Chain A
Amino acid sequence: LRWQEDPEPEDENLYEKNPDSHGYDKDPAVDVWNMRVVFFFGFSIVLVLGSTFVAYLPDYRMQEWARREAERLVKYREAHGLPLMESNCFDPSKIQLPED
């Protein structure tokens, strides 16, 4: 024969001793408080207040500013007859080219 071994323990059903089980623990008071901790700090705190936080981020990565600033510049250069954008990012007077 083979060695001295414990047999396979049968798989427990948490609903047998506790039909009101939330599946967190076999102690029902610990089970209910684990459920309340998960649901309050997960849904009531992180999800709700976190989605509210993300919804009211103060102009995340200055997009709104960038529209408003663009609405300045267009309005400056529509009126002064300038082109809306130059092809040159940098002034060609402040660039030395390698001569050839």
Chain B
Amino acid sequence: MMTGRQARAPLQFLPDEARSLPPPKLTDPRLAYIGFLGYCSGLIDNAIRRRPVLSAGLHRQFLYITSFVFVGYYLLKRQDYMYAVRDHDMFSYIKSHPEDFPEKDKKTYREVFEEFHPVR
């Protein structure tokens, strides 16, 4: 859909306009969930190699957590960028096509007739 939008400047994971956007906080709950997924990967890595699950290889568990948080931070940056691009294109298209988006006359319910259906 938006593939011609990111085709004049291809293969940019985060373009330069993405820096206009606020980055995800480090206490982002999505980023905390990705760190939790890294911790679960570290536990499964101890489990399949028959290491003691919570205790063995704390350096390896911490590199799992760190690597998932590291990749996931940039994935969340790109996610928020693409939804911001989606809304920017939507609003610029509505602003440039007023004949397709008229302001509908809102009626109050004193004029609005709705059919009544009795439950009896």
A residues neighboring B (CB under 8 Å): 94-98
Residues of chain B at the chain A interface (Cβ within 8 Å): 110-111, 113
Number of A-B residue pairs having CB atoms within 8 Å of each other in the complex: 6
Q: Can you list 6 residue pairs at the A/B interface with Cβ under 8 Å?
A: A94-B110, A95-B110, A96-B110, A96-B111, A97-B113, A98-B113
In the complex formed, the residue of A with least CB distance to B113 is A98
Sorted nearest first, the 6 A-B pairs with minimum C-beta distance are A96-B111, A98-B113, A96-B110, A95-B110, A94-B110, A97-B113
Query: What's the dominant secondary structure at chain B's contact region?
Result: loop
- Interface of chain A, main secondary structure: loop
Residues of A contacting B111 in the complex (Cβ-Cβ under 8 angstroms): 96
Cβ-closest chain B residue relative to A94:
B110
List B contacts of A97 (CB < 8 A): 113
B34 to chain A, nearest CB (A): 37
| Min distance, Cβ B100 to any Cβ of chain A, angstroms | 30
A96, B113: Cα distance in complex, Å: 9
**Residues in A whose Cβ lies below 8 Å from that of B110:** 94-96
For residue A98, which residue of chain B has the nearest CB? B113
| Most chain B Cβ neighbours within 10 Å, of A94, A96, A97, A98 | A96
